[PDB]
């Protein structure tokens, strides 16, 4: 896998109460990733850019909402959430 592809995948950390709870239960980091990222690219990117080990990645596609800004109708962009399961022997 080409490394400069891995440098473009992981867009943003995603924090919420569900991500808090998922970190407490099954120590999963929740990432905003690129729209076209597959699970192998995300696993290799977290294993390289964060120097940790990943067990498994579960990716879902969030569809953007439709908003009314000043009686003009727009639609927010879709994005991809990724639940990344850090390994049990890795402790933080």
């Amino acid at each position: 896998i080409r490394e400069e592809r891995l440098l473009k995948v992981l867009r943003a950390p995603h924090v919420s109460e569900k991500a808090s709870t998922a970190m407490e239960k099954s120590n999963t980091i929740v990432l905003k990733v690129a729209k076209d990222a597959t699970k192998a690219e995300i696993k290799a990117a977290v294993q390289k850019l964060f120097e940790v080990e990943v067990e498994v990645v579960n990716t879902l596609v969030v569809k953007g909402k439709v908003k009314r800004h000043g009686q003009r109708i727009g639609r927010r962009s879709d994005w991809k959430k990724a639940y990344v399961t850090l390994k049990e022997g890795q402790n933080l």
């Binding site: 400069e4 867009r11 905003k32 850019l49």
Partner: protein
Amino acid sequence: KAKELREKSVEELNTELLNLLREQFNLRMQAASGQLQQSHLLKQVRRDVARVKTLLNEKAGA
């Protein structure tokens, strides 16, 4: 820049491109967590990458 980068070899430009992509990823994670005050730097880093790639193209083709 674009003149001090034009005086560099192909592997030097590739190493500089890798370093610029690493700083771009680090600044993107910094701004994504709400932590970046100097929000201009992302823009500069973006244009910097473009300069390197443009020079790479004019070192690759001609």
